[PDB]
């Protein structure tokens, strides 16, 4: 309960009193760990943006990374690096566009790679985490393209170069499963499997249609690459779970996040990153609230936690703030991260009790995206 600024004032006072020297220098961030959490601020479409690197245990900003227009951040699960695909222009928001990927050292935060993307091929959209995606081995970044058509761009992080664009069907999002394979969700209600070589026509297979045309799958499904779990809520809180760990899609049984009385009384998911999945606990978290059916991008004040296997409700937390996005640390005794775009504040909760533990405020202009690494 001594704040961090108070501890600091105390120690600097003791250093002055004792004649202690120290060399003013550039700090290193502490080693990445399970409770580092990254919050990205798309800044409501501003041309430049920020990512905050946060120690979630201390509630402390340990670093920042600047980005351009609607960058897609990724974070290597093993903690070796972070990267983003980003877009800049020669004259702020006009002139020559350069898309590029930067890779950063997660301790010095220095860029160790800056890889131009030819022909400005990024999909500029409100930030969806799964629109830019690391393969499991960390060597390849895949980025979605929409214009002129759905396409996926392959970037070699190891050799630091753009590789090629892949032609795909009318599909969206990129859930990588292997060094050379990803899934996409298609307009027709199937998933598409894309398997791609250095050159050649991608191998593209579709699953069966797994949802009717009137059931709407949200833009921010939770995907645990290490568990190959794709947790995909619909607008009503019905949750589609797809198991991709065998390398092909297995459709798991559907669970309702909300009860029928809740649904009858207007309860629905809503926010940006509406859903989190804790791998080790096999638990789903969903931001829900009482709301009309078309207010599905508004903040929510409640998180339901449910067992991913049974659909049993384990908790319903009153977050006590307007929360747009959640995620969880992937360690035991996980933290539940609850970001309020309105408050520009990451609230950090104990995921078990739902209690708010601390918070980090002043995170830019419109922060929306929480990313944690799955380190363990």
């Amino acid at each position: 309960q001594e704040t961090q600024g108070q501890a600091a004032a105390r120690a600097a006072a003791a250093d002055l009193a004792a004649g202690q020297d120290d060399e003013p220098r550039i700090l290193e961030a502490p080693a990445p760990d399970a409770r580092r959490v990254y919050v990205n601020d798309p800044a409501h479409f501003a041309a430049v943006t920020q990512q905050f690197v946060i120690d979630g245990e201390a509630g402390r900003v340990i670093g920042m990374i600047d980005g351009g227009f609607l960058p897609n951040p990724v974070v290597a699960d093993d903690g070796s690096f972070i990267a983003h695909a980003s877009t800049v222009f020669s004259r702020i928001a006009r002139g020559e566009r350069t898309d590029y990927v930067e890779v950063f050292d997660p301790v010095t935060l220095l860029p160790t790679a800056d890889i131009e993307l030819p022909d400005a091929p990024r999909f500029l959209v409100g930030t969806y985490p799964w629109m830019t995606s690391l393969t499991p081995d960390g060597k390849t970044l895949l980025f979605y393209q929409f214009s002129p058509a759905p396409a996926v761009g392959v970037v070699d992080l190891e050799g630091k170069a753009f590789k090629r664009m892949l032609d795909v069907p009318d599909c969206y999002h990129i859930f990588p499963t292997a060094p050379d394979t990803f899934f996409m969700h298609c307009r027709d209600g199937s998933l598409a499997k894309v398997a791609f070589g250095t050159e050649g026509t991608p191998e593209i297979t579709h699953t069966e249609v797994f949802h009717p045309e009137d059931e709407f799958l949200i833009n921010h499904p939770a995907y645990s690459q290490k568990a190959g779990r794709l947790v995909w809520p619909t607008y009503t809180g019905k949750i589609h779970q797809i198991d991709l760990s065998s390398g092909d899609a297995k459709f798991l049984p559907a669970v309702e996040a909300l009860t029928e009385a809740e649904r009858a009384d207007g309860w629905r998911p809503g926010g940006w990153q509406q859903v989190a999945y804790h791998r080790a606990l096999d638990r789903i978290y969903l931001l829900v609230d009482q709301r009309d059916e078309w207010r599905h991008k508004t903040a929510s004040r409640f998180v339901v936690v449910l067992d991913a296997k049974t659909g049993e409700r384990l908790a319903k937390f009153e977050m006590g703030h307007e929360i747009d996005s959640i995620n969880v640390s992937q360690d035991e005794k996980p933290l539940l991260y609850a970001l309020s775009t309105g408050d520009k504040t990451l609230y950090i909760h104990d995921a078990e009790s739902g209690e708010e533990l601390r918070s980090v405020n002043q995170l830019g202009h419109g922060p929306q995206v929480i990313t944690t690494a799955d380190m363990g």
Binding site: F45, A47, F69, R94, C186, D289, H296, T298
Partner: protein
């Protein structure tokens, strides 16, 4: 005010996020940065793509198709931000999805988002 309440359209202030034509707008109303309801501000570039919605006009009891179009080539205005989602569908029905920067076709390859206009293109059916 209640963000979660059913959105109630009005036909009396275009700069307010409940104006009827803004029922599925995402961004900033161009009228607040030097454009108008259906024109882009000086120095920006008007996209030709758009996402659509069926918006009820409480003036005439009719539902109208509003095909939003972005004014591009500038950093986000920062004025009159609004986000409504009536009828808004996920990105895989892009014709109805509004997180996409619909800046395609804008002169000079402009793709940065400055604000959105709300012209009517049809009666809804």
């Amino acid at each position: 005010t209640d963000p979660r309440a059913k959105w109630v359209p009005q036909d009396n202030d275009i700069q307010a996020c409940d104006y009827w034509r803004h029922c599925s707008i995402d961004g900033n109303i161009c009228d607040c940065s030097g454009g108008s309801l259906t024109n882009c501000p000086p120095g920006t570039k008007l996209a030709t793509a758009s996402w659509v919605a069926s918006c009820y006009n409480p003036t005439d009891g009719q539902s109208y198709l509003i095909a939003y179009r972005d004014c591009c080539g500038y950093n986000v205005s920062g004025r009159c931000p609004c986000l409504n989602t009536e009828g808004e569908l996920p990105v895989y029905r892009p014709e109805f999805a509004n997180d996409i920067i619909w800046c395609f076709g804008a002169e000079d390859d402009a793709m940065t988002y400055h604000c959105t206009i709300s012209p009517i293109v049809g009666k809804a059916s």
